[PDB]
């Protein structure tokens, strides 16, 4: 049931604020954390998160977004 998802997003000013708000407010999300030296990957932990819709939203609203990891 418990999921860890890592997405690389293209983030240009207030892009972190905008991407973090979107992921943070996605259904099933418990935690969001910027990782990597450039803080350009988002680690998402929760239950029942739909990774396909998360990637759609991020691509529509923020920029290029690649699924790097899905773990359960």
């Amino acid at each position: 049931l418990k999921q860890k998802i890592v997405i690389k997003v293209a983030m240009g000013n207030n892009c972190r604020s905008k991407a973090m708000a979107l992921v943070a407010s996605t259904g099933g999300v418990d935690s969001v954390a910027l990782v990597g030296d450039l803080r350009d990957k988002i680690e998402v932990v929760g239950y029942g998160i739909d990774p396909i819709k998360l990637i759609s939203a991020l691509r529509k609203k923020v920029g290029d977004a690649e699924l790097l990891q899905v773990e359960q």
Partner: protein, 81 residues
């Protein structure tokens, strides 16, 4: 109060900063109010009932603070720390 006998605090370790070594447990009249994590050999500010209390930690996660009447915050090391 036996801390060896308390459910583990629900926690999230931020991956960008070191993992805090201690669990802490806050009680009003021996009744658990709140819990979380903190660093060893360090310091934090905590809202303890009505007052902000400066709490100091030693390397063993023992917590000293001037707690208001009826309140205490007690620390211990997390598994394998």
């Amino acid at each position: 109060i036996d801390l060896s006998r308390e459910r583990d605090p629900n926690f999230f370790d931020n991956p960008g900063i070191p993992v805090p070594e201690c669990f802490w447990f806050m009680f009003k009249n021996n009744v658990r109010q709140d819990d979380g994590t903190c660093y060893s050999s360090w310091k934090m500010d905590m809202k303890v009932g009505p007052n902000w209390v400066h709490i100091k930690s030693d390397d063993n996660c023992n917590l000293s603070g001037d707690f208001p009447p009826g309140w205490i915050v007690l620390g211990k090391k997390r598994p394998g720390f």
